[model samples]
Target: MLTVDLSGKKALVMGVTNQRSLGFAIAAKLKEAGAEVALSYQAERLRPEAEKLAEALGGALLFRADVTQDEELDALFAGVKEAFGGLDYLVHAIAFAPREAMEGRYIDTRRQDWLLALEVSAYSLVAVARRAEPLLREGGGIVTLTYYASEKVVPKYNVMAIAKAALEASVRYLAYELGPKGVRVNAISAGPVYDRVAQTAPLRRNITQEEVGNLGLFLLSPLASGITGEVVYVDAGYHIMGME
Candidate 1:
């Protein structure tokens, strides 16, 4: 069996709204790999749910952060420092597009919505990374979740696609900026994961949680050491097709 033992490391995962989220899966895998995991939930409404997941993950370090604001981000890292002292890895599994931008025509995307989508989904990674750098000084990894639509056209993926494109660009720049400091940056363009949030839209029907979790675990592991500044896809070979 292939193993990635992270026995003495600590990881801070952002964007866990609930147990069914990608962040939750990443946190679970990090724990299994022997790392202590912490997660950030965006809003107070999500606090109870976030605490519940933390409890389930053997009392994961839980923090409240609204990535759109700088103060909240600082609070989160401060909490991490208090709880884990230093961090070995950071996973950014957060993203959002206004409900209006998620469906229908891309041209219909509004200015405010576009900016909001870009800020929260794409720019937040950079902001979070800047704050995380000092604590992650032990030469660690930075991984974010993205999607295939950034490279190809996917109907109804609207401003989110544009946001991801910027996010991909951020990954490259961040890798270049952090490499001299021994920090690595990369993204995982995961496959269609069918879950409660995904089920919000109809027609997104076939996917398994295990497949997504497995790929996420691999990417977070030392096995992917040489890989950085790129987007790795975990889709079930779906993005390769000319017509899915």
Candidate 2:
């Protein structure tokens, strides 16, 4: 039987904030596949909770990495190199837009909020990938989380939608640039759920973090060597509806 074996591989998963986070689920799945996994959170405020997650995952490394800052990214990668020597894959699961921006009309989005959203949600992928390039082994892959809002209209998604659009575009460019070296890039457009807040999708049910993890497993594993620069959907068929 064919299997997804990640034995001896090492991965760094960013942006895990809670048990329900997609990043944590992906990290958990990575561990189950026999890959050594490490995780990074954004701030000190989340240290207690993030520590619990790291401990639960077989004492995985819990590093602090604020993607928006260069020094933090450098420091996080430094820890990864020291802990694991090199990286086999990276999962970028970070995104944020100010509360005022998310709740208000897109047209009304402040300049500062727009810039911050793009920096954190879109440019961070580029930043992290650049730092991870040398360390990522041959046949390694990179994956980031996105949403349908990037492609179509989703009210309240607003500025983040724009940011995700840029992120998806980056995947294609990065995939092309990295493919020659055997490194692949991709993104997952996941369904809306209540990890931090409740929401509904066309599926009428929320997609579980584990479900996203399963998809991520496939994408990051050698099983998907032929796939790159793609934004595969995991939205329970929500993006397919003509009118929802």
Candidate 3:
């Protein structure tokens, strides 16, 4: 029997909004594995839902962290430090591009929209990792979620796709820089799940949230210690197809 034991581990999961969110599933699975998990919501609108998820997780810490703001990240990690002391893993599953920005042509993307997309979706990883460094334990794992749109041109994905590309690149650089500390960094290019972004996928059947969470479990566990600087795909092999 294969086992992935994470008993007593501490993790901070950002961007958990609802049950359908990848962060929510990952945090749930981590808690089930005996890890003490903390969750974060991006805005006040999501606080109620995120709080309910924390309640369901048997009283996990819930913080308000907007990645675009440094003060929010600082406060969130400060709370984590006070509560958990330090974290063994960090999961970043936040990304956003304005609805207007996502619908139009890549060239038509305005400067402000493009900048907002990159700041939230790509630069936030670096910012969060920087703040998390002092609180992260050695041999720690950091995983972020991306999509196939980062590599391939998925129509109507526009500026967010560009942001995801930067995110994937950041994963490689971060992995290399963090390697000497025994901290690994990686990104999961998850296939389309039955979420708001489901329509972009070429696959007939969508991937489940639990399955993606399972992959996250493995990547953050000791079983995947040797893996870093990689963008592992969880799609139903849709990325391999040239035409579908």
Against the true structure, whose lDDT is highest?
A: 2
Residue pairs in clash, model 1: none
Which regions of candidate 1 fall more than 4 Å away from where they truly are?
194-207
Question: Clashing residue pairs, candidate 3?
Answer: none
Candidate 3 lDDT by residue in tens digits, 111-180: 8888999999999999998988888887798999999888788888899888999999999999988888
The models' CA-based lDDT, in order, is 0.82, 0.89, 0.86
Q: Which stretches of candidate 3 lie above 4 Å from their native place? A: 194-204
Model 2 Cα lDDT, one tens digit per residue, 64-123 = 879989999999999999999999999999889999898779999999999999999999
Clashes of each: 0, 0, 0
lDDT of 2 at 18: 78
Order candidates by TM-score, high to low: 2, 3, 1
Cα misplacement distance, residue 137 of candidate 3 (Å) = 1.0
Model 2: lowest-lDDT 10 consecutive positions: 193-202
Between prediction 1 and prediction 3, the one with superior TM-score is 3
Give residue 107's lDDT in candidate 3 (0 to 100).
88
Clashes of 2: 0
